[PDB]
Amino acid sequence: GENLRPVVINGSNVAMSHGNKEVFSCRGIKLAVDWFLERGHKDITVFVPAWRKEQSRPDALITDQEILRKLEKEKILVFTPSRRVQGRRVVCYDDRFIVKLAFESDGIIVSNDNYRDLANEKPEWKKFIDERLLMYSFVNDKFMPPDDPLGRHGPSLDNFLRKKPI
């Protein structure tokens, strides 16, 4: 774990991708986290907005919701702030937590969204996101990051996840 990069996961992106594409499937977050834990990663942060603790509704379907609170108790998942004002949901943008933490910790970002609004705000964030984004596919419960996260000539996935190539 000493030579490994910190891992920051877009929890909502991963939960939408897993299972039914239109359902927030929390087992998907668990499966991604487990993929990194089994490789020895000890520094993993999953960000999810706090309002995903609300009860399942027809326009916000969720499965295995209890996973979120459990991962929070394990200090793997962190809720980003959300509240109500005058009956309206006021949500802090979780993408900024994800990018800022990965950037300040010299880590990698697990997400199929490449955050072009934040990239266009700060040139250093654009360069960081473009170099440190880990996209992925699920096949059922199989979490499959690409072995070539930066294409043909980039690092192997093994070396992408390390601080110093081995």
Query: Where do contacts with Na ion occur on this chain (CB under 5 A)?
Result: 16, 18-19, 23, 25
- Residue (16 or 109) nearer to Na ion, CB: 16
Distance CA 92, CA 114 (A): 18
* Min CB(62)–Na ion separation in Å: 9
Please choose, from the candidates 27, 36, 8, 33, the residue with its C-alpha nearest in 3D space to the C-alpha of residue 140: 27
61 beta partners: none
* Min CB(138)–Na ion separation in Å: 9
Strand 142-144 with 82-85, pairing: unpaired
84 beta partners: 89
- Residue (16 or 29) nearer to Na ion, CB: 16
DSSP 77: E
- Residue (18 or 132) nearer to Na ion, CB: 18
* Min CB(21)–Na ion separation in Å: 6
Strand 7-10 with 44-49, pairing: parallel
Structure-token match 């880990």, residue found: 134
- Residue (19 or 107) nearer to Na ion, CB: 19
* Min CB(76)–Na ion separation in Å: 19
